[PDB]
Design a protein around this ligand. Structure first.
Ligand SMILES: COc1cc([C@H](C)NC(=O)Nc2ccccc2)ccc1-c1cnco1
Ligand SMILES: COc1cc([C@H](C)NC(=O)Nc2ccccc2)ccc1-c1cnco1
Ligand SMILES: COc1cc([C@H](C)NC(=O)Nc2ccccc2)ccc1-c1cnco1
Ligand SMILES: COc1cc([C@H](C)NC(=O)Nc2ccccc2)ccc1-c1cnco1
Ligand SMILES: O=c1[nH]cnc2c1ncn2[C@@H]1O[C@H](COP(=O)(O)O)[C@@H](O)[C@H]1O
Ligand SMILES: O=c1[nH]cnc2c1ncn2[C@@H]1O[C@H](COP(=O)(O)O)[C@@H](O)[C@H]1O
Ligand SMILES: O=c1[nH]cnc2c1ncn2[C@@H]1O[C@H](COP(=O)(O)O)[C@@H](O)[C@H]1O
Ligand SMILES: O=c1[nH]cnc2c1ncn2[C@@H]1O[C@H](COP(=O)(O)O)[C@@H](O)[C@H]1O
Lengths: 352, 352, 352, 352
């Protein structure tokens, strides 16, 4: 009998061909939708629907109270990071709540200390707890999700992540998650794929997680690796209901951390929460910087405008229809035709 | 049952593998054709045949009256852009017509204002109306094409675009289009693929559109992404009847806009019509520059010479036979062998 | 009958599709393992188990006595290079042995002189002889392995390499090898693939060699091409039992050769043993430099920490379970998402 | 019925997947061959066997009399270029012949003038006429080959080229060619692939041509695109009997043209014969420069040493056995592992 053409005799050793955002384009389809008439609302969780299907990452260079307020006012939501004392994270929940009953989420880990944190976040009025771990396919993480759902699930929605497989998503669904957050390896500041050799290209990860979550009515949050507004449309078309953004929002005025003026231009610090600086285990993230991008409201407007254009091209009046769109797979040469090419760009563009 | 190897359980979610120009080469075949004896004529529309199968883009940095005159004199045609008052666009049609009864086209949009524009262009003597939209697979665009064909179709040919699928091309055929223009995403200055995440690699887009248009006897115009004279031959071999060029013609003396002398070299402005500067929706194009390339006549001579060489290699005495040629698909390493490699180029080449 | 789509009529002419480390990621799986509880021990040979599944290359810029001592103290092993007099190589074996009964290996070639070298290494107390050749699939190399096993195999373990195919691995198993070392072409300083045109991508090479060695109970050493700690996890998941490292260890304080201070930074010499400088046949290696990386102990800690993270993600409590993990194959775009992207890295990372 | 996944309904429109040298590696196999004992002799034509399976390109920056003499003395052969008067090309044939009865070839075109040239080359003592054209799959080229074979074929061997398909190779075999030269598009200075859009990746081109020529006993010359000594082994393994080199030999002392000292280093002019400068049709080649590489004899020694290493790895005692070797196909990531990587090269290598 002939070997598997990539080696050995086990056809399941190399189990899948993983596609990322740059591997696919959305195909145009028959459409009565124009960007103005598209409806961008979508479920964050079973019970919570957002006007704009975007949430900010639970990172100490992305989301504290000002980002959470701005995201909610723009129609999305912030997830407050957990790299700070319990009392301060709960205080920031209260700061968001005092700004008009805006929606807010907050991350917690797993274990006794994370439980105390979760309880004080609930008492502070948080709408969404995000059980936020590097590898959610673990009974301790599943136990955390289910125990939160058991004890405070009437009052608060409970998200679990992160996963990158159908079986891991199914495990979180069975534990009672109100949403499943997908992404192991794809983040712009993540080094898991080189440090551990572990990951899953995000379009395939979403397609697999959605195969478990969609039939259970559980929304999927696509988390990490989105670098363009078009990636939002691709993630939702692969079946996610919202996207979580770190890099694309770290450059905004509302993101915490230093505004850096270096060699005539403007940047802001952006670092993985598994980086050496954030943990102060070998690090699984880097510390870096992103270009300054101005007010959050303006960035969100550009991102949602790109999503609306995709809905016009695909004939999607709603995100639920966009989730039914088809991809074409592209080659490395198609990636060059898919970006502007063979021209020296001379003027600034707001979305490129 | 086993999942689709790229994810999920739907084998049609990723519907196609899209090839662009750089993914294929034309195979040599038995030939009695030399470049001198090839016949490059081809249908622009059902009724209009061009000596040279090339048209200039309807862009305000590519085609006003001087480009339209020069293109017609070279055996092709210009499509006058519509980013100017109706009276001025109609005036430029008259300027071309007063230069010897040369062929000319002009772009219009969709709606009442575009209708008034179309009527004055017809009164000015235009030969071809191009209903020119980002996404033609829309009943309003189809209605525009059919109503123009109904009211003025005896006097003028009516082109509709742009499309990137078989179903969208078929819809324009059924609406009565005299030609179908193909290209969503491929243009050198286009950012639709990153802003919206939408597009289709152009060789596959042409092959699919031709599968609908060729059996209906409707010519296909391949529009966008052509960067070399060899790309003209590839587009026609995939079944298109003409190619529309923006970047390759924007650098010519006849293209409107500024001749820029920067750091000792010469450039000209070239910008998407969906760029911020041209619209003055989030932009779907960039503003940039291309190297100055001299007189249009000389550029067209180089492009048609490359097409003639392809016809010699493929044994194609006519464009209709070139449309029957075969491709070989290449890998990323083949792309390096397909360009000149491992040599420092020391002398200027007119076509490279 | 139709040709093979890549050419000719022989479907076995292009026999395999070879994957390297960058072509695959490890998939997360259900896990009760955290990095702290993983057990990284693994068989170097049939009889020798290491606490850390790492050995240093038998190269004159990687392993002399200080590297061998440090590797053994860290839980792995050094293989002393053979580009020096027999008496000196045997002396370095004694130096390692006098430092606490640490494990040590030493390379030998093939023939009468290599036999004398092997005998004096055994008399000096060496634990592992490595019959170390460019192409082990040769009866002279197989004879060397079997004769060593026959004469001194009670006292010392005998490794043979290098191979890159199932049939070559099977030949070494039949000759009596206590381990099989895999890698033809992949080394960072190797030029065999361009000089001879010969090689095999290392993930496929390991999968094929393991298909012969694993059913015979013979451990596989993955040798060459590992550039990140995640590559260690990938090699072991493909079925190898240990990894051999040149580049990743050449930058350490214990590696022999010059510490180079050039343009404000620190490097160390690193050269192929088939390079012109090491042989003083056309060369099959280059002479170069790698960044200085500090003490070996610290490098090994970072590499094993990355391996432990992979074991946590894959649910592997032991290396034997990690050998059962699954890959996802990635595209060239996935390689960019798999490295940190779209951020200017501003702070040093210990493992990236 | 479902479309072809790359577009349209014709499964033969994209007829093949073309591999180039960088797409494949030779697999190691069981071997009693070492580089010293390999036999590199091979048929140039039906009647002519060379000690070294290498010929120099018929280019005015590669082969005049000094290169032809040096190539013959090294065991290969030169093909004198035809971009000079008939009397001078015939004179250079005589110059080679007066240097010890060395073998020599000379290029001719097609038509009456090429016939006069061929007759005077035969009278001057040439051993091989090379009917040398951009596209040999043409009855005029086939007629030239057959008429030369009819009139002078007792005295001289007749080669025809260039082709890139099985059908074109078969046509030259039927015309009576004593060898078939393969390569449309691959040359380092060639721009046919971008100017005309025409070509065929060279490994697939050789495999297809060999499928026609080998069963007829007609040797195949692999011409163009070879950039490393390992590419020689790959071309012969794909079934070619000799390789023709332009770039790799243009940098030698014996190549005609200027030795250029620019910014402290040494180069020599190298230009396509379809470049503007050589023709003084749109050009299908560029004018450039290559690094100076010293005496031809030394370059040939390095190239043949790499070929001998490949024969050792593949177990090929003769070129006829090397023609039976197998490839592994590699990915873009394998191309990086196949070159030296992640090391700053600090010392010159003679073959890299
Ligand atoms: C604090 O944040 C993170 C810390 C890490 C640490 C560095 N690694 C780690 O926990 N590895 C691990 C543990 C158990 C099982 C398998 C591996 C890694 C990732 C993140 C992070 C943050 N958003 C996504 O991931
Ligand atoms: C003015 O020209 C263009 C404006 C645009 C604008 C920016 N986008 C847009 O209209 N989006 C859209 C609308 C409806 C449905 C789906 C999406 C985009 C492309 C072009 C253009 C010009 N040649 C080709 O495309
Ligand atoms: C001294 O070390 C090496 C010398 C060489 C020499 C340069 N090549 C060579 O022996 N070729 C060969 C011989 C027989 C059959 C086939 C080809 C090549 C590789 C290495 C080396 C060191 N770790 C791995 O490879
Ligand atoms: C003088 O040398 C060459 C001139 C050319 C010219 C520029 N092109 C040309 O002849 N095209 C052609 C003619 C007939 C049918 C199809 C196309 C192209 C290639 C070469 C050349 C030299 N070694 C290989 O190719
Ligand atoms: O250090 C880390 N290692 C791995 N992933 C991280 C780390 N820090 C944050 N993340 C993830 O990366 C996401 C942001 O990715 P980005 O939008 O591509 O920048 C976050 O929402 C987290 O899921
Ligand atoms: O801003 C824009 N966004 C997208 N496509 C554009 C825009 N402006 C012009 N185009 C298209 O791009 C084509 C030119 O592409 P090029 O020849 O590759 O430069 C035009 O003929 C239009 O179809
Ligand atoms: O000159 C050489 N040519 C080919 N391989 C070599 C040479 N020198 C050392 N090696 C191999 O390369 C390995 C190290 O590869 P690295 O870890 O990728 O730097 C060694 O363990 C040997 O197997
Ligand atoms: O201008 C040209 N256009 C296309 N091919 C050329 C031209 N000049 C020489 N060649 C081919 O290129 C080969 C050399 O390729 P190289 O070894 O890759 O530099 C020659 O032997 C010819 O077959």
């Amino acid at each position: 009998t002939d070997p598997v053409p990539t080696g050995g005799d086990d056809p399941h050793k190399v189990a899948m061909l993983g596609l990322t955002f740059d591997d696919v384009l959305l195909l145009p389809a028959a459409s009565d939708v124009v960007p103005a008439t598209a409806d961008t609302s979508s479920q964050l969780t079973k019970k919570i629907r957002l006007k704009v299907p975007l949430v900010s990452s639970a990172m100490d260079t992305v989301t504290e109270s000002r980002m959470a307020i701005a995201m909610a006012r723009a129609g999305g939501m912030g997830v407050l990071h957990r790299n700070l004392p319990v009392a301060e994270q709960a205080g920031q929940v209260e700061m968001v709540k005092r700004s008009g009953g805006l929606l807010v989420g907050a991350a917690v880990g797993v274990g006794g200390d994370a439980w105390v944190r979760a309880m004080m976040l609930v008492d502070a009025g948080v709408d969404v707890l995000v059980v936020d771990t590097a590898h959610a396919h673990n009974r301790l993480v599943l136990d955390m999700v289910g125990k939160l759902k058991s004890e405070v699930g009437d009052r608060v929605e409970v998200v679990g992540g992160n996963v990158a497989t159908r079986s891991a998503a199914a495990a979180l669904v069975d534990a009672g998650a109100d949403a499943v957050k997908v992404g192991v390896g794809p983040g712009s500041i993540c080094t898991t794929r080189v440090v551990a050799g572990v990951g899953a290209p995000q379009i395939t990860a979403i397609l697999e997680a959605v195969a478990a979550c969609r039939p259970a009515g559980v929304p999927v949050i696509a988390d990490g690796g989105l670098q363009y507004s078009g990636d939002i449309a691709k993630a939702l078309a692969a079946g996610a209901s919202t996207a979580m953004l770190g890099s694309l929002l770290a450059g905004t005025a509302e993101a915490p951390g230093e505004l850096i003026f270096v060699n005539g231009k403007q940047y802001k610090s952006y670092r993985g929460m598994g980086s050496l600086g954030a943990m102060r285990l070998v690090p699984e993230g880097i510390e870096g910087r992103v270009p300054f991008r101005g007010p959050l409201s303006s960035v969100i407007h550009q991102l949602t405008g790109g999503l609306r254009a995709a809905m016009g091209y695909t004939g999607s009046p709603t995100i639920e229809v966009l989730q039914q769109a088809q991809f074409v797979r592209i080659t490395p040469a198609g990636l060059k035709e898919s970006h502007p090419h063979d021209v020296a760009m001379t003027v600034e563009a707001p979305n490129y």
